[PDB]
């Protein structure tokens, strides 16, 4: 069953991976309404597609800046992977294209805003609430890892809540297709596995570590390793000593000791039973994995939605006009985009 599902999913992925889609829309098909988020190379805007009237999130990246910052591979990875995957808790790329100056990735608009804002607003999530989202991530990494994909940037800021209270994973900026070890120092300091920080070379297990950090943060309201600066954080991480809030259940603590495990021969997700170690853990005993996959479980939280184009679930950012040069820039670097 899951075996069967995963093998067909891999055929589907490989077809698209091998022959990615390209140039399916163009800038003037969309009216830009508001910035939803920014980044190193550009920004993410709420846009409206003129002919359908549907709203989308348009991720905009300055080609020149991408080359300068040595992020070509990561950016090509992001698009190539996002266009080939398909899973209920992954955001959908609807269109992509490029112009003289920029790269564009147009995704389904997920209006519920980031998990991050809801988490900080409410303080922390109850274990059933945290457990509902964690199951989604477990299934998602099982899918991704089966395609040889490492996600590498799990955090509440990259998880969006949809109109049904379900998670949409966004930001494939550090996602990578690889069998074996890889070495890039990337992610978010609070979430880095010890093996990333010690520059040992690492594999998919870092995603499972990050899950433990995420479950901790959701349940505690704060991360297991925090400080004012990255350096300090890496010290606590490699220390590995973790303390748990008084309200954590015994099962939760046991699960987290297994995920936040410095020893890779012992970290859950990484053993002989693989993910099943996680799925069959006591803390997940009330979880209906199929129902979750099917999105038939009632969500604990359903974002308020003041209609199409509503961005009240997002913070406001300062806007700036999108420049497109009359000169093509970096054409060769981004030929495959």
């Amino acid at each position: 069953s899951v075996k069967e599902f995963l093998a067909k999913a891999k055929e589907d992925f490989l077809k698209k991976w091998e022959t990615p889609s390209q140039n399916t829309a163009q800038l003037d098909q969309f009216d830009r309404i508001k910035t939803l988020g920014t980044g190193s190379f550009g920004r993410v805007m709420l846009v409206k597609h003129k002919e359908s009237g549907n709203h989308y999130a348009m991720k905009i990246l300055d080609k020149q800046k991408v080359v300068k910052l040595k992020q070509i591979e990561h950016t090509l990875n992001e698009k190539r992977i996002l266009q080939a995957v398909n899973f209920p808790f992954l955001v959908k790329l609807e269109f992509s294209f490029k112009d003289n100056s920029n790269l564009y990735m147009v995704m389904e608009y997920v209006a519920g805003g980031e998990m991050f804002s809801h988490l900080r607003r409410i303080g922390r999530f109850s274990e059933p609430h945290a457990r509902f989202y964690a199951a989604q991530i477990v299934l998602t990494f099982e899918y991704l890892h089966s395609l040889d994909l490492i996600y590498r940037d799990l955090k509440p800021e990259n998880l969006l809540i949809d109109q049904q209270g379900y998670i949409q994973v966004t930001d494939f900026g550090f996602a990578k297709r690889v069998k074996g070890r890889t070495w890039t120092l990337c992610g978010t300091p609070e979430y880095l596995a010890p093996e990333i920080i010690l520059s040992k070379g690492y594999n998919k297990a870092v995603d499972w570590w990050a899950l433990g950090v995420l479950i901790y943060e959701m349940a505690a309201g704060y991360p297991p390793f925090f400080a004012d600066q990255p350096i300090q954080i890496y010290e606590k991480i490699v220390s590995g000593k973790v303390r748990f809030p008084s309200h954590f259940s015994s099962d939760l603590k046991d699960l987290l000791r297994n995920l936040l495990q410095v020893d890779l021969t012992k970290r859950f997700g990484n053993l002989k039973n693989g993910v099943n170690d996680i799925k069959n853990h006591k803390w997940f005993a009330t979880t209906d994995w199929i129902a979750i996959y099917q999105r038939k479980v009632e969500a604990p939280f359903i974002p308020k939605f003041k209609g199409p184009g509503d961005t009240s679930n997002f913070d406001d950012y300062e806007e700036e006009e999108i420049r497109v040069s009359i000169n093509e820039k970096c054409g060769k670097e981004f030929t495959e985009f």
Binding site: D171, T184, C186, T188, P189, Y222, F226
Partner: peptide, 20 residues
């Protein structure tokens, strides 16, 4: 408390990704 110390810290807002 741990919460009070976290909440008083400089990293309670959106966290930026880092790379090589």
């Amino acid at each position: 408390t741990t919460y009070a110390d976290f909440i008083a810290s400089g990293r309670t807002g959106r966290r930026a990704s880092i790379h090589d």
